[PDB]
Design a protein around this ligand. Structure first.
Ligand code: QIC
Ligand code: QIC
Ligand code: NI
Ligand code: NI
Ligand code: NI
Ligand code: NI
Ligand code: NI
Ligand code: NI
Lengths: 251, 251
């Protein structure tokens, strides 16, 4: 039903706020962590794919340690988003799995993101590896250009559950207003008929913004907001996001 | 596809906020108007079915006059919601039509609400009469038991346009979460396929609250908020409503 990471219970109450941190170097990461330190969010996602030379595990881990030193009371989600799913760089399957297992081993991260389309064998063994070390797994899938049919969105979320994800996650891009409703339809069907754990769903862009606010009623356990003044289309600031989620929760 | 009521342009920018004033006597009506001066909304709906002496035209017009003396800078919408459609009192078709014609004649109201299923002939004649006096017509339909199929909702909104409504309006009750999406789908399809003027849609109760907040993206031009108490299930406090509409508008 719920997933507890530290003191945070995902799948209960108002949806949780995730913010993404991007830095190319340890200095960039430190600067961002310091700017994020006082902001009101629940989970810090480190977008590792923006970091240079990720194949040097030690550099990555030094940066993870730096984040933990600065942001000490928020769960840390380690996410290498591959270029094929909108990320900044690509790694071989072996390198990607090695990177994630190194994060797990470090004891510095509370959760890792694993992409559904990495491959069943590798994904499932790494979920097992993360669990042995008390690290939670968000399994993810993204389509930055379009919205698949509701039935296919549900299928992907169900597959993530079958592969052992603690929290299935899907983000899709609407081309029309109807696509936003398609994503919400999939969220409702999944949460009502198949889900046995928290799920995260979102429809990107300004058009899909309602998907970031309607999680409590339709079934999304978390959403993403921005800390920076200058954000992107559909990225509500964390203070405003907290304001709206609280209004809906207390209504 | 816009309607101008005083300086307010409905169908443009963020959705407009309507609040309902409910008072039994002229004394209650004046007291509520005073309180409502301290709320932030765009259109004042007077729910005439809450008024006790509705069959005495002179009392009704005195009450309307009192509202106008207190709330001078907001368009006034005259609405007798029939018991049949979720209101507080029932009237014969003739009494209902004459009440609205009396409101039109007074020169005190900017808009009247006419229920779609009152009867085609009566509705068409009353719309013509309103227009002769430069009074706008919100044509309405309510289902407090269920959410008809999306196509039926669309056909009712289309019919309202055919009968000459300035702003078609429909409120339905969800029995499930998917029903909320059905209402939003009908809003989009009406907007895409047939709307040549603003429309107002809402899924009632707490379950449908998101429908009252997402009008800018899906096509609803106005939304109802509560000042002290709700005039229908699902309305949230007017200050919180404006806050959410603004955050979404800037997203
Ligand atoms: O990383 C994702 O899954 C995001 O959905 C990508 C993009 O949509 C951002 O605007 C979101 O804040 C987060
Ligand atoms: O907000 C609603 O659901 C309403 O039912 C909408 C409209 O019918 C108004 O006349 C009511 O006072 C409230
Ligand atoms: Ni609470
Ligand atoms: Ni170990
Ligand atoms: Ni396990
Ligand atoms: Ni593509
Ligand atoms: Ni604006
Ligand atoms: Ni006249």
């Amino acid at each position: 039903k719920t997933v507890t990471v530290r003191d945070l219970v995902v799948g209960e109450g108002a949806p949780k706020i995730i913010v993404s941190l991007m830095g190319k170097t340890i200095t960039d990461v430190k600067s961002e962590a310091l700017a994020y330190r006082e902001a009101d969010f629940d989970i810090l996602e480190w977008r590792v794919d923006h970091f240079a030379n990720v194949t040097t595990a030690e550099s990555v881990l030094e940066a993870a340690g730096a984040i933990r030193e600065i942001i000490t009371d928020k769960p840390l989600l380690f996410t290498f988003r591959s270029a094929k799913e909108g990320g900044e760089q690509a790694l071989t399957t072996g390198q990607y799995i090695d990177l994630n297992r190194a994060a797990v081993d470090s004891g510095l991260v509370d959760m890792i993101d694993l992409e559904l389309f990495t491959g069943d064998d590798e994904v499932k063994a790494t979920v097992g590896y993360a669990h042995q070390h008390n690290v939670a797994v968000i399994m993810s899938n993204h389509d930055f250009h379009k919205t698949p049919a509701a039935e296919e969105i549900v299928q992907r979320l169900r597959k993530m559950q079958e592969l052992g994800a603690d929290i299935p996650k899907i983000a899709v891009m609407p081309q029309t207003k109807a696509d936003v409703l398609t994503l919400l339809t999939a969220t409702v069907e999944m949460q009502e008929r198949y889900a046995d754990r928290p799920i995260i769903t979102m429809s990107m862009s300004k058009t899909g913004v309602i998907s970031r606010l309607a999680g409590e009623v339709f079934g999304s356990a978390a959403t993403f907001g921005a800390v920076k003044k200058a954000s992107a289309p559909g990225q509500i600031s964390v203070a405003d996001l907290r304001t709206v989620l609280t209004i809906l929760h207390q209504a």
